[PDB]
Design a protein around this ligand. Structure first.
Ligand SMILES: *Cc1c(COP(=O)(O)O)cnc(C)c1O
Ligand SMILES: *Cc1c(COP(=O)(O)O)cnc(C)c1O
Lengths: 471, 474
């Protein structure tokens, strides 16, 4: 029904948590998983991350003990999500924010906490925690040098594990009705996995707890798992560290699963494709860990896995196939890239223009002609489309007539006002895959932008016609 | 309590909606609005848009009437959000998706609809609806040319308004306990405003219904409100059209408010700054319309405004200050750009290097020196940091990281310097202002001056140096 949100909320802080649990039947069918893979969609919170809970909780704990007054400054090292949570709490309750985060983290997080009025200091990616330039070290320095500064230190604050122990684990227990068999959590600061695993093993001791640690970190036990890649940076952000935080109770976890960046990202893409959950890279890491760990289970029993943050923090980072190509990551089993690679193959627009028989050339105009003369030329030449020379764009007779009737195109007005400005430059050597990719952003694709002696325009409908000629 | 999500959900479609209502006390205090401004945070749905509801429900209607079977293809013209909703519905229930959307719309929508495995064809932005190259006309053509293809036509499908009439407006009424005085809705296809306004006027006739359409659309009544910008393109996505959709009943709405791009985006950033709602531009337009319409209201009464979609669809578009500067929009009264403009002004890094006093040339290394020789030279020169050459510029190296990596088993003594150097860096020049280097420091930890006369760098600059400079002023 409507119990948590049926009322009126005083602020965004009152909208943190209460994240739904969804069954990943399609992904399990894809990967051949017998058990029920449940997903705690923590990325659906108000801040789009699991760290909203610990941010709100640290702020409430600070205010409860009188350790924090209005106008004070908050400094916090984070991979990006705790910074966003604390910036939200500060913008709501009137606190100043100064964030220290490594340069490796995506720019979306920095821009988001900039929109929230948080000063952001960046730290080198390769710097260990001991260094003078670590995000925690720079946080401590800023705390020392600044007046009325505060650091809640999510790496050691007791609120971080205790709140996942109090509300999050209780949420998953109440919705799973107590019957939980396997719990897969990503290992960052470790407060989440500690709290959740402890609270679920208290009331459901038969449940197994497996932690996910990226290849590069030293959080998994024993070190024989880390020796694959020790202290080497990874493209996934949010999980893994070069030290055990105070809130991480490594004795709560039963298994550890090392996951690389490629597997994490391809599993996140598979989640988005098959389930429709806009999740982050750490979610893909956790889901691949679950796919590796829960294979011994059968139907009936349920394995819950966390989805820490949403795609918002990595919109331009890993959703874009170009960045996946620059890193050489397998995009997905079922995706548009491989579909186009299979259907088009090595076909280039030379083959299409030759098999069609387009020995014609689209007429040209000086891009400053009047509507009267261009209408005369369009009616006398019998062709439909025209491209304006110099590129400015394209112009069709239908748009000409409709805009002239719509009161936007006077007869004496220049063509530049009524032309189509969106265009994509191509050349005959380009493959059909790349022009199909470019058509995702531009409606038309003009060729030959040698000499300006292009032949015509190519669009998606022509690609579908080409796909109908073959096969 | 826990009523809607206390159980397990079979799919993502069962997790859309149920969006909470938040009171925007801080934004009202900032803008000086006496009444209670309620915000329906529709952007927090599973798909991050208000169109998730209409997509799910149109698919439910198609399946319930036997008009849709597994394996079929779904085609729909959209500004980006209805496409996302129908793509989620298709990926879950096993349908094929082909989307037609104008090129004006953001690239994040295109990329995310590619992630759901949907074919995406674009249409020219300046194309009128009568053109055969418009998204709706191209969708009709694709339906004509393809087998088992269907168009649900959110512009004419009666599910679109009736869902907001059935569930969304009921949610608003239950959350407001019936007492609603004003309701402000953005006018795109017109389904949401029609449905919600009708359902509230049925149960709360005292409630006024105000519609928001961008300057450029012709949905306002009378036409004297459009003559500002007749059929002029706008940057906001989701609201306004060049024709009245079949679902929009313009008689349901009482007032109309025109909003431009600049006001919409400035109000969206102000919402993000003061309330903490990662929301989109059309919501800023709606909130500006509400601020201009409910000014006459007094304390106690409630003015409800809908926020259709989230910032995810405009992450790189309007959250980034660079693009808003490219379009010349006032970012916000209180923001980092104007704060730095005020605190720093026209100050350049030469003033900082002169006031502190550099009179020095930072040590330099060939970036292939052994750790033995670099530690020897650093101890003999007494300096702390060093800059390493090409193996362009590679970066900086500090003795702290040297020692800590050496003991960490990551720095051999015979290893090259490039292993331990910092690879994130930003190129600067003495003439650069403090504001631009402060902006660049948001992405790079270090900033080196005068890179590539002669390659004679004068020093390295960090945020702490800017704070120390601000400590010499008041
Ligand atoms: C915080 C976070 C996690 C989980 O970290 P914990 O320390 O275990 O709470 C996972 N992924 C991302 C991206 C995160 O930001
Ligand atoms: C669709 C949409 C609207 C309005 O849609 P209606 O159905 O006409 O209410 C507003 N903003 C955005 C971003 C949209 O996508």
């Amino acid at each position: 029904a409507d119990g948590p949100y049926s009322g009126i909320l005083d602020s965004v802080l009152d909208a943190i948590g209460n994240t739904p649990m969804v069954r990943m039947k399609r992904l399990a069918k894809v990967y051949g998983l017998e058990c029920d893979l449940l997903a705690k969609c923590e990325f659906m919170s108000a801040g789009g991350s699991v760290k909203d809970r610990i941010g709100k909780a640290m702020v409430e704990k600070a205010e409860r003990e009188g350790r924090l007054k209005a106008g004070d400054t908050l400094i916090e090292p984070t991979s990006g999500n705790t910074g966003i949570g604390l910036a939200l709490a500060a913008a709501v309750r009137g606190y100043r924010m100064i964030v220290t985060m490594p340069a490796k983290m995506s720019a979306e997080k920095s821009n988001i906490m900039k929109c929230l009025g948080a000063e952001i200091v960046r730290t080198p990616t390769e710097a260990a925690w001991n260094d003078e330039n670590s995000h925690m070290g720079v946080a401590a320095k800023l705390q020392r040098e600044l007046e009325n500064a505060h650091i809640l230190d999510q790496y050691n604050n007791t609120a971080n594990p205790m709140v996942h122990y109090d509300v999050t684990a209780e949420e998953i227990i109440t919705q799973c009705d107590g019957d939980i068999d396997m719990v897969v959590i990503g290992a960052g600061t470790g407060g989440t996995i500690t709290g959740i695993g402890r609270k679920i093993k208290e009331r459901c001791p038969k449940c197994k707890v497996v932690g996910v640690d990226p290849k590069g970190s030293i959080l998994a036990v024993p070190d024989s798992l880390n020796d694959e890649k020790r202290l080497q940076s990874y493209e996934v952000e949010g999980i893994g560290y070069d030290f055990v935080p105070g809130v991480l109770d490594r004795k709560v976890v039963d298994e550890w699963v090392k996951v690389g960046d490629a597997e994490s990202f391809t599993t996140a893409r598979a989640i988005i494709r098959n389930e429709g959950l806009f999740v982050g890279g750490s979610s893909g890491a956790n889901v691949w860990g679950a796919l590796q760990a829960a294979r011994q289970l059968k139907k009936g029993q349920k394995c819950v896995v966390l989805l820490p943050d949403s795609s918002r923090n990595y919109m331009s980072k890993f959703i874009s196939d170009e960045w996946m190509a620059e890193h050489g990551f397998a995009p997905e089993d079922g995706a548009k890239v491989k579909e186009r690679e299979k259907q088009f193959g090595g076909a280039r627009i030379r083959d299409l223009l030759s098999e069609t028989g387009a020995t014609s050339d689209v007429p040209f105009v000086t891009a400053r002609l009047s509507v009267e003369d261009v209408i005369k030329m369009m009616h006398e030449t019998k062709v439909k489309e025209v491209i304006v020379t110099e590129l400015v764009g394209v112009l069709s007779e239908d748009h000409i007539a409709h805009s002239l009737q719509s009161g936007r195109c006077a007869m004496q007005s220049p063509v530049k006002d009524i032309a189509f400005k969106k265009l994509a430059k191509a050349l005959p050597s380009a493959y059909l895959r790349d022009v199909a990719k470019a058509l995702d952003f531009s409606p038309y694709v003009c060729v030959m932008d040698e000499c300006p002696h292009f032949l015509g325009v190519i669009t998606r409908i022509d690609l579908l016609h080409w796909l109908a000629t073959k096969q």
